[PDB]
Design an enzyme around this catalytic site. Structure first.
Site, PDB file in Angstrom:
ATOM      1  N   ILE A  77      10.547  12.095 -15.779  1.00 47.95           N
ATOM      2  CA  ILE A  77      11.711  11.611 -16.432  1.00 47.95           C
ATOM      3  C   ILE A  77      11.149  10.411 -17.405  1.00 47.95           C
ATOM      4  CG2 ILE A  77      13.430  12.174 -14.562  1.00 47.95           C
ATOM      5  CD1 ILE A  77      13.337   9.352 -13.579  1.00 47.95           C
ATOM      6  N   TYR A 121       4.575   6.291  -5.042  1.00 50.70           N
ATOM      7  CA  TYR A 121       5.940   5.973  -5.195  1.00 50.70           C
ATOM      8  C   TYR A 121       6.733   5.988  -4.132  1.00 50.70           C
ATOM      9  CZ  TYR A 121       7.207  10.899  -5.650  1.00 50.70           C
ATOM     10  OH  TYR A 121       7.586  12.082  -5.515  1.00 50.70           O
ATOM     11  N   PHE A 177      15.987  10.570  -0.396  1.00 55.21           N
ATOM     12  CA  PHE A 177      14.747   9.590  -0.499  1.00 55.21           C
ATOM     13  C   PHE A 177      13.436  10.726  -0.747  1.00 55.21           C
ATOM     14  CE2 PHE A 177      16.768   6.053   1.279  1.00 55.21           C
ATOM     15  CZ  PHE A 177      17.967   6.504   1.835  1.00 55.21           C
ATOM     16  N   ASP A 178      12.684  10.147  -1.292  1.00 51.78           N
ATOM     17  CA  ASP A 178      11.382  11.058  -1.698  1.00 51.78           C
ATOM     18  C   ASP A 178      10.255  10.089  -1.837  1.00 51.78           C
ATOM     19  OD1 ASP A 178       9.810  13.464  -2.805  1.00 51.78           O
ATOM     20  OD2 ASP A 178       9.812  12.474  -4.833  1.00 51.78           O
ATOM     21  N   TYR A 225      18.279  12.325 -15.116  1.00 56.20           N
ATOM     22  CA  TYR A 225      18.485  13.942 -15.320  1.00 56.20           C
ATOM     23  C   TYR A 225      19.737  14.192 -16.016  1.00 56.20           C
ATOM     24  CZ  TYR A 225      14.468  14.305 -12.192  1.00 56.20           C
ATOM     25  OH  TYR A 225      13.274  14.159 -11.773  1.00 56.20           O
ATOM     26  N   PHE A 229      13.295   3.537  -7.972  1.00 56.77           N
ATOM     27  CA  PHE A 229      11.958   3.747  -7.592  1.00 56.77           C
ATOM     28  C   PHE A 229      11.111   2.508  -7.405  1.00 56.77           C
ATOM     29  CE2 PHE A 229      11.326   8.314  -8.503  1.00 56.77           C
ATOM     30  CZ  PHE A 229      12.398   8.761  -9.500  1.00 56.77           C
TER      31      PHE A 229
HETATM   32  C1  LIG Z   1      14.138  17.307  -9.673  1.00 60.27           C
HETATM   33  O1  LIG Z   1      13.039  17.430  -8.892  1.00 60.27           O
HETATM   34  C2  LIG Z   1      12.286  16.476  -8.059  1.00 60.27           C
HETATM   35  C3  LIG Z   1      12.634  15.206  -8.219  1.00 60.27           C
HETATM   36  C4  LIG Z   1      11.951  14.456  -7.524  1.00 60.27           C
HETATM   37  C5  LIG Z   1      10.911  14.941  -6.464  1.00 60.27           C
HETATM   38  C6  LIG Z   1      10.735  16.138  -6.393  1.00 60.27           C
HETATM   39  O2  LIG Z   1       9.898  16.973  -5.384  1.00 60.27           O
HETATM   40  C7  LIG Z   1       9.107  15.843  -4.351  1.00 60.27           C
HETATM   41  C8  LIG Z   1      11.335  16.832  -7.187  1.00 60.27           C
HETATM   42  O3  LIG Z   1      11.203  18.308  -7.130  1.00 60.27           O
HETATM   43  C9  LIG Z   1       9.712  19.086  -7.520  1.00 60.27           C
HETATM   44  C10 LIG Z   1       9.121  18.253  -8.280  1.00 60.27           C
HETATM   45  C11 LIG Z   1      10.020  18.166  -9.490  1.00 60.27           C
HETATM   46  C12 LIG Z   1       9.739  17.054 -10.243  1.00 60.27           C
HETATM   47  C13 LIG Z   1      10.937  16.678 -11.258  1.00 60.27           C
HETATM   48  C14 LIG Z   1      10.322  15.382 -12.069  1.00 60.27           C
HETATM   49  O4  LIG Z   1      10.313  14.256 -11.018  1.00 60.27           O
HETATM   50  C15 LIG Z   1      10.373  12.896 -11.774  1.00 60.27           C
HETATM   51  O5  LIG Z   1      10.151  12.910 -12.960  1.00 60.27           O
HETATM   52  C16 LIG Z   1      10.394  11.761 -11.014  1.00 60.27           C
HETATM   53  C17 LIG Z   1       9.334  10.862 -11.141  1.00 60.27           C
HETATM   54  C18 LIG Z   1       8.017  11.461 -10.503  1.00 60.27           C
HETATM   55  C19 LIG Z   1       8.335  11.491  -9.091  1.00 60.27           C
HETATM   56  C20 LIG Z   1       9.555  12.445  -8.836  1.00 60.27           C
HETATM   57  N1  LIG Z   1      10.546  12.470  -9.537  1.00 60.27           N
HETATM   58  C21 LIG Z   1      12.101  12.533  -8.744  1.00 60.27           C
HETATM   59  O6  LIG Z   1      12.926  12.494  -9.545  1.00 60.27           O
HETATM   60  C22 LIG Z   1      12.022  13.047  -7.701  1.00 60.27           C
HETATM   61  C23 LIG Z   1      13.534  12.462  -7.015  1.00 60.27           C
HETATM   62  C24 LIG Z   1      13.837  13.084  -5.694  1.00 60.27           C
HETATM   63  C25 LIG Z   1      14.949  12.828  -5.038  1.00 60.27           C
HETATM   64  C26 LIG Z   1      15.143  11.220  -4.711  1.00 60.27           C
HETATM   65  C27 LIG Z   1      14.744  10.577  -6.548  1.00 60.27           C
HETATM   66  C28 LIG Z   1      13.641  10.941  -6.965  1.00 60.27           C
END
Ligand SMILES: COc1cc2cc(OC)c1OCC/C=C/CCOC(=O)[C@@H]1CCCCN1C(=O)[C@H]2C1CCCCC1
Length: 124
Positions: free
Chosen positions: A71, A41, A51-52, A97, A114
Site C-alpha cells: 500500500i 511488521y 491482526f497480521d 485499500y 502497523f
Molecule cells: C489484502 O491482503 C493482505 C493484506 C495484509 C496481509 C496479507 O497476507 C498476510 C494479505 O493477503 C496476502 C498478501 C497480500 C498483500 C497485500 C498487500 O499488503 C500490504 O500492502 C500491507 C503492507 C505489507 C504487509 C501486508 N499488508 C496488509 O495490508 C496486510 C493486512 C492484513 C490485515 C490486517 C492489516 C494488515
C-alpha cells in the site's frame, strides 16, 4: 494521547499517514525508491477484528520500495525510516485499500495500523 497523533508524512499534508518513531535506527540514509527492503511488521485493522504479523510466517517480509507492491502508506512510510528503526503508522483508507477495500481481509474505508521494524535494505 489522541488518535490523530504522529507526524503527517504525506506530500499532500492530509493527515492520512501519521508516523511515530518508537525505536530510533542508525545511519543517515533512508532507502531510495527501488531498494529491496527487509522488514518485520505487526499490522491490524483499527477496529481490532484482524491482526497480521510477519512473525506468523517466521520470516522477514521483503518488498521493493516504491514499486507499489505494498500500500501507498508503506512506500511513503518505509522511505522515511532508518535501519533498525521501529515505527508506527496510522493509515487512512486513501493510503491503504480505499473505498473498494480488499475483501475478505480488508473492509471498505478501513483505517490500518502497523508497527514496522526496518531490518535492512539493499540497492537493486
Ligand atoms: C489484502 O491482503 C493482505 C493484506 C495484509 C496481509 C496479507 O497476507 C498476510 C494479505 O493477503 C496476502 C498478501 C497480500 C498483500 C497485500 C498487500 O499488503 C500490504 O500492502 C500491507 C503492507 C505489507 C504487509 C501486508 N499488508 C496488509 O495490508 C496486510 C493486512 C492484513 C490485515 C490486517 C492489516 C494488515
Amino acid at each position: 494521547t489522541v488518535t490523530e497523533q504522529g507526524e503527517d508524512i504525506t506530500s499532500k499534508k492530509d493527515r492520512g499517514v501519521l508516523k511515530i518513531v518508537k525505536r530510533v535506527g542508525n545511519g543517515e540514509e533512508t532507502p531510495m525508491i527501488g531498494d529491496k527492503v527487509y522488514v518485520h511488521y505487526k499490522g491490524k485493522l483499527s477496529n481490532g477484528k484482524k491482526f497480521d504479523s510477519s512473525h506468523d510466517r517466521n520470516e522477514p517480509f521483503v518488498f521493493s520500495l516504491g514499486k507499489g507492491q505494498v500500500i501507498k502508506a508503506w512506500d511513503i512510510g518505509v522511505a522515511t525510516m532508518k535501519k533498525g528503526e521501529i515505527a508506527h503508522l496510522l493509515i487512512k483508507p486513501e493510503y491503504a485499500y480505499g473505498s473498494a477495500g480488499s475483501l475478505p481481509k480488508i473492509p471498505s474505508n478501513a483505517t490500518l495500523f502497523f508497527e514496522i521494524e526496518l531490518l535492512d535494505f539493499k540497492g537493486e
